[PDB]
């Protein structure tokens, strides 16, 4: 059974595509946008966010904010050049944690970049990075199709 997660727009990561080694063709050097968004349907860490507890767990690879990433979609800039867009959906509580702790927000941004890199075999720039003041890139964020074992425990069947 496939469930739908309708993400709530939050903020955008702007970057650059350095290389594409995946099953599909992408143009190197094109602008990349990542929509960091949220839903209460995304799993969340079992350990509540407390900086002194959690940052050592992150170093130990024992704690992470779960991310559900969409397939990429194409948009175009004003000169007609292709730009690639991904949605990275996290639990709504985790979206509030990254408001109050800038160190956690930086790590979450890195996790979102790695998530797109993993799912589509792309390499994204860590230097040519920006944070547009918009909530999302593009029109309505499309629904994420997920299996029931991917949902937050309290929202499973």
Residue numbers in the entry: 28 to 184
Provide text from the study.
The R2TP complex is found in organisms from yeast to humans, and consists of the AAA+ ATPases Rvb1 and Rvb2 (human: RUVBL1 and RUVBL2), a TPR-containing protein, Tah1 (human: Spagh or RPAP3), and Pih1 (also known as NOP17 and Pih1D1, but referred to as Pih1 henceforth; Kakihara and Houry, 2012; Te et al., 2007). Pih1 is the multipoint scaffold of the R2TP complex, coupling the Rvb1-Rvb2 hetero-dodecamer, the Hsp90 chaperone machinery (via Tah1 in yeast or Spagh/RPAP3 in metazoa), and the TTT (Tel2-Tti1-Tti2) complex implicated in activation and stabilization of PIKKs (Hurov et al., 2010; Kakihara and Houry, 2012). The biological roles ascribed to the R2TP complex are directly associated with its ability to interact with the Hsp90 chaperone system and function as an Hsp90 cochaperone (Boulon et al., 2010; Izumi et al., 2012; Takai et al., 2010). Here we present crystal structures of Hsp90-Tah1-Pih1, Hsp90-Spagh/RPAP3, and Pih1-Tel2 complexes that together define key structural links within the R2TP core in yeast and in animals and reveal how R2TP connects the Hsp90 chaperone system to the TTT complex involved in PIKK activation.
